[model samples]
Structure formats: C-alpha cells, structure tokens
Target: SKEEDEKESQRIASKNQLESIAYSLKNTISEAGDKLEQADKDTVTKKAEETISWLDSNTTASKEEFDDKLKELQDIANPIMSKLYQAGGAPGGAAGGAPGG
Candidate 1:
C-alpha cells in the first residue's frame, strides 16, 4: 500500500509538471503574438528572430530556469496579445474568420 501510494504521488507530480510546461508554452505563444501585434512588421520580425536566438541558446538548460524564462516571456506578452485577440474579433466570433458573413 505504501509503495502504491508513493507511485501515485510520483505520477501526479509528473502530470503536474507536464501541465505546467504546456501552460508555459501556451503563454509564451500568446505573448509572442501580442508583441508582434504591437510592433511594426520589421520590429516584430526582429524580435521574433531575437527570441528564437535566445531559445536556441538556452535550450539545454535546467528545467527550472527554462520554465522561468518562458514564464517571464509569457508575462510580458499576455496582456498585449490578449488585447489584440479581443479587438480582432467580436465577442464569440471565430478568430481570423470572416466577419459579418
């Protein structure tokens, strides 16, 4: 029973970690979109390239720091991108869809 309990705990922990990683990635993408929306085309392209550089540079780092940097990026990008999404569609409208069709 004790061993089973420990295994269950480990499973839950692993699941939580995976979920956290997924959320972090989603947040990062959302934030990146926001940044692009707020920038001119040239600036957005530059930023995207820079971000890719940073990600490539640190891809082998420990999980904790990797998640931290991702969270930071998400925090910076969320509000702006969320606003852009909100403005791009009516309430309950499909994203990137034809409007008033």
Candidate 2:
C-alpha cells in the first residue's frame, strides 16, 4: 500500500509537469493565434467569433450560462487556431514557431 501511494504521488508529479508545460504552451499559442487572427481569413475563426459575440449580447441567459458559452467558444477556437498556428500562418510562416506550435 505504501509503495502504491508513493507511485501515485510520482504519477501526480509527472502529471503536474505535463500540465505546467501544456499551460505555458497554451498561453504562447493563444497570443500567437490571436495575432495571426488579425490577418486571418479562416471561416472557423470568424464563425467562432461571431457566435461568441452573439451569445455574449444575450440578456436572457444566466451568468453561468454566459460564461459557459464563452468557455465553449474558446474550446472551439483553440483547435482551429492550432491548425492555423502550426500551419505557419503567421508572419513569414515560421514552422513550429511558438512553444509547441
């Protein structure tokens, strides 16, 4: 039992490291994606932005529901942005430019 607990702790530590790296990477990519988005012509980004704008303007939705929509927008946006980000869509089209791009 003690050995299993120690192993679990190590697993958690490893997971933490993975999460930290992922966190930092997401931060870098989001900004890079945003910048690319300025000049972007993709419909995915446009659709997501428009949908989020539409949801945000609604006065009928509860606060949590509004926030959930925002989260949903982000969730939809990130993968699409990643597709653009790693496609070297930004200035000069640098491959894998961002942290984990």
Candidate 3:
C-alpha cells in the first residue's frame, strides 16, 4: 500500500470518457454498417442506444454503476472494432462476439 501511494493516479472510466468513446464507436458502426452483418449491426446499435441513454444519467459516478455499464458497452463493441479494423475482411465482418470477457 505504501508503494501504491508512492505511485501516480491512474483512474476509472472517468465520466464522459465512455460517452466520447461511444460516440466514436457509433460513428464507426455507422460507417461500417453496410459491411457489418445484420446481427453485428444490431449488437452495436443496441449498445449505442443503451450507453447514450446512460450518458444522460450517471456518468459521473467514477465507480461501480458507471464502470459496470461502461464495461458492458466495451464488451460488446471492442471486439467489433478490433475485428473490423483487423480483418475488414472475420468470421464474416463481426462475430457479434463478446470482448472484455
């Protein structure tokens, strides 16, 4: 714990960070929509809706509730972005699979 105190302050999801990221992801999803599978598109869209709604509410917690939902969106979307950026070409444009797993 002493050493921990001696260190710097890395942090939580940090309020608007999630929303900012979600916006980016939303735009990415939109750009890739034509290439994404129906199910993958649905996965991304559903998370975008949920996260944007969350942004309207408790984005300031810097704790459990915020991290929980933030993690959920990350779980759903990161895989898609990574795979999209990587393969562009995966299990056929997103497996709709879970990341942050």
Give the number of the best model, judged by lDDT: 3
Give the TM-score comparing model 2 with the true structure, all chains together.
Answer: 0.39
Tens digit of per-residue lDDT, candidate 3, span 8-51:
12123344576677777778777786666778877887788778
lDDT of 1 at 8: 59
Which ranges of candidate 3 are over 4 A from the true structure? 1-13, 59-62, 89-101
Comparing 2 and 3 on lDDT, the stronger one: 3
Compute the lDDT of residue 20 as modeled in candidate 3. Answer: 76
RMSD of each: 8.9, 12.2, 7.5
The TM-score ranking, best first, is: 3, 1, 2
| Candidate 3 whole-model C-alpha lDDT, 0 to 1 | 0.66
Q: lDDT for every model? A: 0.49, 0.52, 0.66
Off by over 4 Å in 2: 1-42, 49-53, 89-94, 97-101
lDDT of 1 at 40: 39
Q: Show the lowest summed lDDT stretch of 10 residues, model 1.
A: 38-47
TM-score of each: 0.42, 0.39, 0.59
